[PDB]
C-alpha cells in the first residue's frame, strides 16, 4: 500500500480588511493531522489528531516559525501576482499551494510534487522529473525563469526526496493504529414507492473507513450502468464515511436486483437484496 504526506496552503487577500488570511493544512494519506490558521487568537501550528499530541515541543516551535515565514512571504506573492497580471487593485485574490510526496510500500518515492494556483487556477507546477517547471501562462513564465535562475527545483527535490519521505514514515509510526485501521461498511437497502408502479431501491453503505468504496446494482448478473443515481462519498463527521446508490425498478420486480459493496475492510464484497 502507498502513503502520502501532503501540505495544502491558502493565502487570501482582503484589501482594506487588514492583511491576508493564511492557512496551512497537513494530511497523512487523507487524514488532516496539523493545521496553522493565521486568524486564530494566537496563531501556531496545532495537532489535529490525538496521535500528534505526542511530539516534542521543538516540533511545534520550528513548524510554527516556518508557517509564519510562509505567511509573510505569501503576502508578497499576492502583491507580486497582481503586478504580473496587471490587475486592478482592491479585489480579493487567492494563492494556493500543494506540496507532498507519495511513497510506495517499498519506500520508493512514486510522486513528489509542488503546485501553485492563482485565483483557483493552475499557475505553476514541478514536473514529475523534479527538475523542470510547467508554467500555465505568461505571468507564471516570469516565476519559472526566476526559479530556474535561483535553483528552486533542486531545493524542492531535496525536500521531497528527503524530509518529506522521512517524516511521512515518522507520522505513520505515530498514528498507525488510527491511520491504518479499516471500518467495514454497514450496508442496507431502502425501498421507496414512486408513482406509476415504480420503486426506488437505495443501497446504503455507512460507517466505513477509509473513504474508497464501490457500490453497484445488478440485474441478472450485469451491472446497471446508467439508470443508477450515485452520491459523492461524504463524511459522517465522526471519521467514517457514507455513500449510496439507487436504481428505479418495476413494482413487483424488486427481488431480481442486488446491491454489491466493495471495500478493503470486507474479506469479500457484500451482496444485498430487498
Amino acid at each position: 500500500g502507498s502513503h502520502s504526506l501532503r501540505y495544502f496552503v491558502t493565502a487570501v487577500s482582503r484589501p482594506g480588511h487588514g492583511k491576508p488570511r493564511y492557512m496551512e493544512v497537513g494530511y497523512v494519506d487523507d487524514t488532516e493531522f496539523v493545521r496553522f490558521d493565521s486568524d486564530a487568537e494566537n496563531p501556531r501550528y496545532e495537532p489535529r489528531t490525538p496521535w500528534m499530541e505526542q511530539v516534542e515541543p521543538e516540533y511545534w516551535e520550528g513548524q510554527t516559525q516556518i508557517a509564519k515565514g510562509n505567511e509573510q512571504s505569501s503576502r508578497v506573492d499576492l502583491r507580486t501576482a497582481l503586478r504580473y497580471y496587471n490587475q486592478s487593485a482592491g479585489g480579493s485574490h487567492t494563492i494556493q499551494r500543494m506540496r507532498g510526496c507519495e511513497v510506495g510500500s517499498d519506500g520508493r518515492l512514486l510522486r513528489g510534487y509542488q503546485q501553485v494556483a492563482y485565483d483557483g487556477r493552475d499557475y505553476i507546477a514541478l514536473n514529475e522529473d523534479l527538475k523542470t517547471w510547467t508554467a500555465a501562462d505568461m505571468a507564471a513564465l516570469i516565476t519559472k525563469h526566476k526559479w530556474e535562475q535561483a535553483g528552486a527545483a533542486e531545493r524542492d527535490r531535496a525536500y521531497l526526496e528527503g524530509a518529506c519521505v522521512e517524516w511521512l514514515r515518522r507520522y505513520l509510526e505515530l498514528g498507525n493504529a488510527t491511520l491504518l485501521r479499516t471500518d467495514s461498511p454497514k450496508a442496507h437497502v431502502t425501498h421507496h414507492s414512486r408513482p406509476k408502479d415504480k420503486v426506488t431501491l437505495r443501497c446504503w453503505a455507512l460507517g466505513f473507513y477509509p473513504a474508497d468504496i464501490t457500490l453497484t446494482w445488478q440485474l441478472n448478473g450485469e451491472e446497471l450502468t446508467q439508470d443508477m443515481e450515485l452520491v459523492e462519498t461524504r463524511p459522517a463527521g465522526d471519521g467514517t464515511f457514507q455513500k449510496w446508490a439507487s436504481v428505479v425498478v418495476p413494482l413487483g420486480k424488486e427481488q431480481n436486483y442486488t446491491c454489491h459493496v466493495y471495500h478493503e475492510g470486507l474479506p469479500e464484497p457484500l451482496t444485498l437484496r430487498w
Binding site: 501540505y7 496552503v9 496551512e24 497537513g26 516540533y59 520550528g62 513548524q63 516556518i66 508557517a67 515565514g69 510562509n70 512571504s73 505569501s74 508578497v76 506573492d77 507580486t80 501576482a81 504580473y84 494563492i95 499551494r97 506540496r99 501553485v116 499557475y123 505553476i124 516565476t143 526566476k146 526559479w147 535561483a150 528552486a152 531545493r155 524542492d156 525536500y159 524530509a163 517524516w167
Partner: peptide
C-alpha cells in the same frame, strides 16, 4: 513537516 515556500 512543512518547509518554506519560495516566493513567486
Amino acid at each position: 513537516v512543512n518547509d518554506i515556500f519560495e516566493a513567486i
